[PDB]
Each structure stands twice: as C-alpha cells, then as structure tokens.
Design a protein around this motif. Structure first.
Motif, PDB file in Angstrom:
ATOM      1  N   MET A   1       0.817  -1.209   0.000  1.00 26.97           N
ATOM      2  CA  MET A   1       0.000   0.000   0.000  1.00 26.97           C
ATOM      3  C   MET A   1       0.854   1.264   0.000  1.00 26.97           C
ATOM      4  SD  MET A   1      -3.149   1.004  -0.121  1.00 26.97           S
ATOM      5  CE  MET A   1      -4.675   0.694   0.765  1.00 26.97           C
ATOM      6  N   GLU A   3       4.130   1.610  -1.291  1.00 25.61           N
ATOM      7  CA  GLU A   3       4.815   1.825  -2.573  1.00 25.61           C
ATOM      8  C   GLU A   3       3.865   1.748  -3.775  1.00 25.61           C
ATOM      9  OE1 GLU A   3       7.786  -1.583  -3.179  1.00 25.61           O
ATOM     10  OE2 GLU A   3       6.928  -2.066  -1.222  1.00 25.61           O
ATOM     11  N   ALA A   4       2.729   2.430  -3.674  1.00 24.20           N
ATOM     12  CA  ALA A   4       1.844   2.619  -4.811  1.00 24.20           C
ATOM     13  C   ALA A   4       1.249   4.017  -4.833  1.00 24.20           C
ATOM     14  CB  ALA A   4       0.719   1.574  -4.805  1.00 24.20           C
ATOM     15  N   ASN A   5       1.627   4.881  -3.889  1.00 20.99           N
ATOM     16  CA  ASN A   5       1.118   6.242  -3.791  1.00 20.99           C
ATOM     17  C   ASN A   5       2.249   7.223  -3.517  1.00 20.99           C
ATOM     18  OD1 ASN A   5      -1.999   5.781  -3.810  1.00 20.99           O
ATOM     19  ND2 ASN A   5      -1.206   4.324  -2.296  1.00 20.99           N
ATOM     20  N   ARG A   7       3.724   8.766  -5.913  1.00 20.23           N
ATOM     21  CA  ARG A   7       3.412   9.841  -6.850  1.00 20.23           C
ATOM     22  C   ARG A   7       2.496  10.890  -6.227  1.00 20.23           C
ATOM     23  NH1 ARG A   7       3.611   4.900  -9.248  1.00 20.23           N
ATOM     24  NH2 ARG A   7       4.927   4.689 -11.111  1.00 20.23           N
ATOM     25  N   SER A  50      -6.939   8.589  -1.222  1.00 21.39           N
ATOM     26  CA  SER A  50      -6.228   9.847  -1.433  1.00 21.39           C
ATOM     27  C   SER A  50      -6.765  10.969  -0.556  1.00 21.39           C
ATOM     28  CB  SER A  50      -6.302  10.247  -2.906  1.00 21.39           C
ATOM     29  OG  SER A  50      -6.041  11.629  -3.070  1.00 21.39           O
TER      30      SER A  50
END
Length: 79
Positions: A1, A3-5, A7, A50
DNA sequence: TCATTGAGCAAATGAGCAACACTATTCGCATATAATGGGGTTAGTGACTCTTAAGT
C-alpha cells in the motif's frame, strides 16, 4: 500500500519546494506522513485512499518546513 | 594610668536554597469528494597534467 502512492507524495510536495528546504527532504517527510496515513486508514467510509492520505502528507510536510528550515526556530503555535 | 597590640563578637546586609503552587510554553495528534513523475543551471576560457578507453 505504501509503494503505490509515492506519486501522490511528489504531487503534494511539488508546491512546497522553495520554502527553505530541499525538494528531496520534502518527499521523504511526505513518505513518513504517508506511512502514518496507511497505518490509521479506515476503508468503510467509502473514500479510496487519497482524501485521507492528503491531510497526513500535508501535515508532515508543513511540520517539516516549520521546524527544520531556519536556524532561529519558531514553534508552530507562535508563528 | 593610658595607648598599642592580639583576639573575638553581635549585627546588618548580600547570596542563596528547598519545597510547593500557579501558569505560560511546547509538543503529540487529527483534518475524510478528489487530488497519483521536478526545475535549472553554463554557456566567446587557456593551458597543462593524469587517468581511462577504444584503436593499431
């Protein structure tokens, strides 16, 4: 969770760049805030990730630039 | 008999401590629609030396 946000962290810290701190310090402290948002996230309120993560990332970046940006440090309540 | 030396003493002031009570600072924590890859140099150097690397 986490290493997917990353950005999202660079998208938030893109605006806090020339505030007295390096760009890489901002996204590092944003990653710390992203971990703190992952650990205390509740999925049952319908929101995806987010809208909950943005507040914690902005808080960690703001508390980074309010303390580690000047020699004569003013606390956040006094400023 | 009195000035001189040797010793000390109550008292006033300056410094400070010890424990406790109130209070102004400071820090940990929380924000719930959605938000998902960056700026910024150096631009009309010169000459020389040392190391690495393709070419023979």
């Amino acid at each position: 969770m986490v290493e997917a946000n990353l950005r999202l962290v660079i998208s938030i810290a893109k605006k806090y760049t020339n505030r007295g701190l390096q760009f890489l310090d901002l996204i590092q402290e944003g990653n710390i805030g992203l971990m703190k948002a992952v650990d205390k996230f509740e999925y049952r309120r319908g929101y995806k990730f987010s809208t909950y993560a943005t507040w914690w990332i902005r808080q960690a970046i703001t508390r980074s630039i309010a303390d580690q940006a000047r020699t004569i440090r003013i606390p956040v309540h006094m400023i």
